[PDB]
Every structure is written in C-alpha cells, then in structure tokens.
Amino acid sequence: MREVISIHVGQAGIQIGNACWELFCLEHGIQPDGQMPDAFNTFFSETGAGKHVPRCVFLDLEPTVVDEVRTGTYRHLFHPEQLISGKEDAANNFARGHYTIGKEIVDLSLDRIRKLADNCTGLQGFLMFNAVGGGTGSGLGCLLLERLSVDYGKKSKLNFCSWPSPQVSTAVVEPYNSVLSTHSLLEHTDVAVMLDNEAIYDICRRNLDIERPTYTNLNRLIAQVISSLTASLRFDGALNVDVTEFQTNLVPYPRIHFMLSSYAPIISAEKAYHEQLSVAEITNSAFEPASMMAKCDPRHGKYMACCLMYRGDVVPKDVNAAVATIKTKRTIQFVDWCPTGFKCGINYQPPTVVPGGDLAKVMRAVCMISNSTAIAEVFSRMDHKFDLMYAKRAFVHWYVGEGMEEGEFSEAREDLAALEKDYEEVGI
C-alpha cells in the first residue's frame, strides 16, 4: 500500500533517526528484536512469521556511531546492510564528502535504497535527516540527493536539517559547510524543515524546566515531531493528510520551500496533570515564538501557509473555533495574497510517549509546520558570517586540496543571494 523511506546521514542523522525508531517501535508495539507479542506497513516490512524490519538507511562515514548501533541494544531491529559505515570522517569538509571519500560509499547505499524501493509500489516519499554543518551530513546529503533526483525524480522528499545558529554551532567552518550545500538543497529538494539546537534547548528550559537534558532528549522532541507528521498516514483520522498533500498545499512556489517546525504542548510530567491542555490554549501556544524550533522571530515576517496536525481525542469542531480566534488577532500576520492560509488534520490516536522521556500525557497535540518569510533572518546573518570569513581566503586550502576549485564558493554566494531577494519580492 503506502510506505515512506527515510535517510539518516551524519552524526545528527544517526541519533535523530535513532530516537525516531524507539518511538515508532513503542507506537506500533514491536519490541526491539523484531517480534510483536496493518497500520505498521508504512514504516515496517513483514520479514516472515511476525518479523518486521524498518525501512531506512543509516549513512555515516564515521564508523564510531554506526558500529555502536550495530553492537548496541538495537543490533537486530535493523538490516545488516541497512547500517552503512565508512572508514574515515569527512571532518567538516564538503569538498571530500562530495568528491573523493564519499564516492565509494554512495553506490553502496543506493543499491540498498533501490532494494527498499522495489519492495512495494505506492512509495509515498523520501524523508531524510542530516546535519547541514557536518561534513558527512552535507557532502553525502548532497551527493545522494543529486542522483536521487536523477533516478527517482518525480517522488517527493522531506528534509530535517540541524541548521546552525548565531551563537551555537560547535564548529568554526560552519558558514562554509552550510551554504555550500544550499546550492543543492534549492535546485533538488522539495520540502525542507529547518531545525535549531538552542530552539530545542530553551523549549526545555522554560517549558520542561530541566537544566540538563543532553542531545538524546533533543532527539526525543524531534521524534515527536516526525511521528506527529507521518501518523495521519499511519492511522485513520477525521481529516486525513499525507505527504503528497503536504507537497502540494504548503509551498506556493518551487523556490519558496523552507518550513518552520514547532510542537505543542511540550510539557513536563508534573505540569500537564495539573491543567487543562485544551484545544484553544494548545493552538494559542503553538504559534507564539517561544515554541518555535528555528529561533527566528516572526514579528518582521508573515506566515505563508500553516498546517496543524492534531491527534488524540480532538473533536473536529473546536479546531475551527481555535483557528477563528487565532486568525483574527493581530499578533500573527499573513501575506495579503492568501485569504485562507490553513489546513487541519485530525488523527484519533493519542501519543504513546516514551516512559522516562520528558514529555507528559497529552490527550491532544499539534505539530506545527509553517512556511513563512521569517526564513530571511535565519539566513541573512549566515550570509554575513560567510562574507566575513571568505573575504580573506580563510580555510580555502582545506577545500581546494581534494578537488573543489575556488569559485564554487562564489556561485553559491549568488545562489544564496538569489534566495533572499526571492523572499522580499514574495512578501511585497
């Protein structure tokens, strides 16, 4: 029937895709080794008598993270050649992750992708998870997705990039490694969702009030978002929506395709039991900027489209009541050329929250995926840091040493510059 194939490239891709699969295995009830003690078709196969195998690939040339899921606790949830490892890192280098050290492993990945694609027809789309500032996540994310648009051109694709931030990047070559791959993720990709590290840090600071959850709990929040996106395919609902409806509905233009994620109500175990998490207040908390997941302030921007995916015991009549009061208030603003700008999708299944994770019980939850012109300010400071770095030929010798000539910085500079001038001609 319907299936979705997910890619997980880089250190961010392996760990985010990790937490995506314990959430799915608890959701469909499959315990780790592959047994259950037909709604699980879209993420699992049927490998015999009660066996189910996930449909994904795990690509990282660092073998330090792939051998550790090979020999960790989920050794036999995954196929043995679903976990693909290289020999050495790309080490924050788009040049050799695309040309020299990434070449021998792309064909070793696509022969398993082609295997997963020939399983059943009706393959709905191509989700993927990568770091844009990692050498493997950017070089192999670009090089896979270049020829994937050559081969599987018509099929849609979703993106979840751990985009950098003006304060926290854990890197110094971050302006180089990030917008060198934006030359490819404009011409090739279809719908891209931007993520940010401290957007998840402070959404646990002032909602969970936990001073010390590490990277593993960020992956839990992102797993919440991915599950709440795809679960209208997974289960039945009052108003269904699938990947190809997202593909058509949200993006108005082929070159304005950058979303903005949120989730609500992200609430601690002692807060949620003491209050009505109702439809009206959850939607009101979904749009306010402290719940955002890119750390971009939408006061100087306008929302383009807004898609809300409810779940649980939401009666579908006060969805319209909660939207009527959020459209009429002046804090959020639409561009003038969309009278209507919304879509709601209802799902009956409540979350099966991972026990011991920081999320609490929600009888109702919305994941927010919105296009906006607030993607201008998340990229404008990125262009300023690129200009401040490249002006004196910093770090270029680590890039031209493998076969990436000077000039692909500059032709990516006016591709990015064409991106911001694309924004204000849309808004005004």
Partner: protein, 130 residues
C-alpha cells in the same frame, strides 16, 4: 558536446568494412569502445586545472600529486590505444600476409605432383625394358 560527434561517423566506417567481403576482419567492436575510452581521457585536459595556496611543503606535494596523476594518465591513455593498433591491425594484415606464404605451398604441391607423375613414367619405361 566537444567530441561526442566522433562516434557516429566511426561505425559508418564499420558498416562499409562489413559490406566489403574481400577484406575479412575479426571482431573489432572492442576497437570501438577503446578509441572512445582513450579519447574521453584526453578531452578534459584543457579544463583540468589546480590552484595552489600560501606555500607549505604539505600543499605543494599533494596538489602536484594531481599533475603526475594525469601526466601519467596521458601515458596510459596513449599506450593501450597504441598496442591495440599494433595487435588487431596485425591480425587483419595477417590474412593477406598468409597469402604470400601459401603461394609457396602451391609451388610445392605442383612440384611434387609433377615429379611423382614423372616417376610413374620412368617406372612404366623400366619395366618394359626388363
């Protein structure tokens, strides 16, 4: 397309060579793809460029390692195309070159037949004398 027009006129030489039944030749469609392969690894050399940086011995040795990779690659790309012109043009010239050395077996066979038939004549003569 800088040199992609050079394949099409090449097999037009093949179909005329096949229709010429006098000059019989063995299978030389290996010949097609190697005159392709040698020429494709000669076209990019006016586009292959490297640029150095602020000179340290690390930079100069590895960046120049590209240039002896492709100056050696011109040496490979010349050497299979020359040896295979040496061996297949040998094996198609070997059919007319076989013809001169089997012009000698025509002389040898006629000499043996004529001399043995002469030996029949002297045996007929000698038996009647006795």
């Amino acid at each position: 397309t800088p040199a992609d027009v050079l394949k099409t006129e090449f097999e037009l030489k093949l179909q005329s060579l096949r229709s010429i039944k006098g000059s019989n030749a063995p299978a030389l469609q290996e010949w097609l793809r190697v005159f392709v392969s040698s020429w494709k690894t000669l076209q990019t050399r006016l586009k292959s460029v490297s640029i150095p940086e602020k000179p340290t011995e690390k930079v100069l040795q590895l960046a120049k390692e590209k240039i002896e990779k492709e100056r050696a690659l011109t040496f490979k790309a010349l050497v299979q195309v020359q040896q295979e012109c040496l061996r297949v043009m040998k094996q198609v010239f070997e059919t007319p070159w076989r013809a001169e050395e089997l012009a000698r077996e025509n002389k040898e066979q006629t000499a043996k037949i004529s001399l043995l038939s002469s030996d029949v004549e002297k045996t007929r003569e000698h038996t009647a004398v006795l």
